[model samples]
Target chain A: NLPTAQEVQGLMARYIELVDVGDIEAIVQMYADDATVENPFGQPPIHGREQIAAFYRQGLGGGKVRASLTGPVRASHNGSGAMPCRVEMVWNGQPSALDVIDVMRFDEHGRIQTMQAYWSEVNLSVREP
Target chain B: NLPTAQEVQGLMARYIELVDVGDIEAIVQMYADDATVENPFGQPPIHGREQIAAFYRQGLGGGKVRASLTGPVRASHNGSGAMPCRVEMVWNGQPSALDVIDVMRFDEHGRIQTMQAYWSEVNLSVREP
Candidate 1:
C-alpha cells in the first residue's frame, strides 16, 4: 500500500528541518544506502552512502548556510515528494540566495531512494549585503 | 546547448500564465508529439500527442479552475525546471485549492518531453465558499 499523504509530507518536512539544522550526518541517514543525489539537476548524481556523506559535507559544513521552505511540500500518490526552498548563504563573500526545488523519491521503508535538486546559476541571486 | 536559465524560467512562467488563462490548446502545444504526462505522479502516464491532448481537455475545459505560481520557477542546468503553484477551483460543491509542484523536461526544440506533477489529496484544502 502507498504511504499516507501526511506521512510523506512529514518526511519531507523532516528532511527540510535536517537540512536547515546543517546536520550532514543526520541528513545522510534520511537516505537509503543505495540512494543517489543530484544537488543540481544536470550534474551527475553521487551514488551510495559514502559519496553522499562526502557530498553533503562539502555543501553543508559551513554552518552559516540557511534554508527554509518557500511553500508547502507537495506529496505524490507515488512514493515521492517535492518542496520548494530558499537557501540563503554567503557566496564568494557576498550574501546570496538560491531558489531550489527538491524532489525526493522514497523507498518502501521511508528512506529516500533518489534526490534531485532543481536549480542553476540563474536561480542564485547575489544579495546587496 | 541547453536552454538559458532565463529561457527555462520564462517558459515556466508562460506555462503558469497559460494555465491561469485556461488555454487548453495552447498548453497542449507546449509539449512534443512524443511527450508523456503524469498528472499526479503516481498515475500511469498519458503518452503521445493525442492522449496528451485528451488528458488536458478534461482537466482544463472546466473554466472554474484558476492557478497561480506561489514562487519563482527553479531552473535547472539541464533543460528542465520545477515550479510550485496554488490551484483554486470548486470540487464536490466546495471551493478548494491544491498545492502542486510541476517538473517539466524539455526536448531540444524546447517542447516539453515529460511532465510530472506532484500533489495528493492531502495537499487539497476545501475552503468555505
Candidate 2:
C-alpha cells in the first residue's frame, strides 16, 4: 500500500525541523542513494547522494540558518507533498530571508527521490529579522 | 471554518481543466478580487483580478495549450493546496512543455487569494508530442 497523506505530511514537517536546526547531514540522509535535487527551475539538478550532500554542505553547512514552515504541508497518498516556508539567514552581516516552496516525491522507503525548491532572487529579501 | 482539503482538491482539478482548454476568462474567475499570482520565485507578483486576467489572456488565450495534473492535489484544512502538473503547448510551430508545481491559498469565499507557480526555464522542454 502507498503511504498515507498523514505520513507524507509528517515527512515534510520533519524536514522543516531538520533544516531549521542546520542538520546538514541529517537532511542529506532523508534522500535516497540516487536521489536528485533541483533548487530553482533554471539550474541543473544535483544527482546522487554524494553530490546532493556536498551541495547541501556548501549551502547550509556553515551558516546560522533558520527556517520556518509558513503553513501546513499538503500531501497526497502517493508519497508526494509540497510545503511553503520562509528561511532566514545572515549574509554579509545582514539578515536576509526568502520565501520558498518545496515540491517533492518520496520513494517506497520514505526517502526523497526528487526534491525541487521554488524561489528566485526576488524572493530573497534583506530585512531586519 | 476553512475549506476542506477535498474542496480545495476539486478547485484545483477544475482549474487544470480550464487551463487545458485555454479558457482564460473562466480561469480568472477562480481568483479573488485582490488575488495575486507569481509564476516563478524571483519575479514580482501580479496583483488583483484585472492584472491576473490580463496576464492569463496573454499567456493562455492564443496558444494551443493543454495541461494535465501529474499527481493528486494535496490540500490542507486552512484552504491551502498544491498540485504538480505538466503543461504542453505549441510555440513557434513546435511542441513544448513544462513541469509545474502550483501552491495556492484560498480566501473565505473559496477564491484563490494567492497562486504561486513553481517552475523554471530549465523545466521547459521541446519534444515531439
Candidate 3:
C-alpha cells in the first residue's frame, strides 16, 4: 500500500499546481469521496468530498490564490505525504502570504483521504519572509 | 519500509506519555542522533538531538506539562506518522493548553528523524473548548 518516492512527489506537485491554478473541482477530485480536512484548528473539520469541494471553492477565492513548495515533499511508505509551502493570497481585502505545512494521507487509489493544513494568522505576512 | 499501524500508534502513545511525564531526555532519546524540528513558522529549525533536547527542555518547562491524543494516529507507508493532540501547560505563569498536530518521519530503526509540530498561539486556549 506504499507508493514510491516519485509518486509521493507527484502527488504534492500536482496538489500545489492545482492550488496555484485555483482549480477547485480538480483539487476536490484529488480527494476521496469521504476525505476530511482541518485547517488552523478551532473550527470543526470539513468532511465529505462535496463539503470539501465547497470549502475549497470559497477558500481559493475563485483562483486568486497561489502556492509554492518551500521544501521537498516528505513521503511515507504508508501512503502519507507532507508539504511545506508558502501560500500567497488576499485575505480580508489585503494581500498576504503564509507559511503552511499540509499533512495528507492517501487512499488505496492514490487520492487524498485526509488533509490538515498547519497555519495561522501569526504565520501570515504582508511581505514574504 | 512502512511500519505497521500498531507501531505508529504506539509511537504516538509513547510520545504523549513521555511528554506528559516531562521526560525531556527520554523524549530526545526517541529521536535519531541527527534530527530536525520546527515548531510554528518564524524561528529557525532545531537541528541535532542535542539542540532538539535543549529546546524541549525549556519548552516543556521542566515537567510542568500534560497531553492527550485528540484523534487516532495516522500512519503512512513511508514510515511517517501524525498525532493530533491537546496539550495542557502553563505559559507565562498562566494555565493554558493548545491544539497541536505533530508530523513525524521515522528512521530505519524506528526513531524519529524529523518532527514538525503544527501549532500557533491562535490554537492556544485558557480554557478547553
Residue-level error in angstroms, candidate 2, position B38: 0.2
lDDT of 3 by residue, A22-93 (tens): 888899989889888977533468999888888888888643688997645655445666666788887766
Top of the candidates by TM-score? 1
For model 3, residues B1-129, the per-residue Cα lDDT tens digits are 545545766886799889888888899989988888877423467899889888888888653688987645655434666666778887756778776767787877888888877555545668533
Q: Quote the true-contact fraction of every model.
A: 0.93, 0.00, 0.00
Model 3 alpha-carbon miss at residue A93, Å: 2.3
lDDT, residue A55, model 2: 89
- Candidate 2: chain B TM-score equals 0.92
Number of clashing pairs, model 3? 8
- Stretches of candidate 1 off by over 4 Å are none
Q: Cα deviation in Å at residue A113, candidate 2?
A: 20
lDDT of 1 by residue, B18-124 (tens): 98888878898899999999989999999998998788777876538889988889998689999999998888778899999999988888888999999998889
List per-prediction Cα lDDT, in the order shown. 0.88, 0.77, 0.74
* lDDT for position B96 in model 1: 91
Query: What TM-score would candidate 2 get against the native?
Result: 0.54
Best candidate (score: DockQ):
1
Candidate 3 clashes between residue pairs 3 or more apart in a chain or in different chains: A76-B77, A76-B78, A77-B77, A77-B78, A78-B76, A78-B77, A78-B78, A79-B77
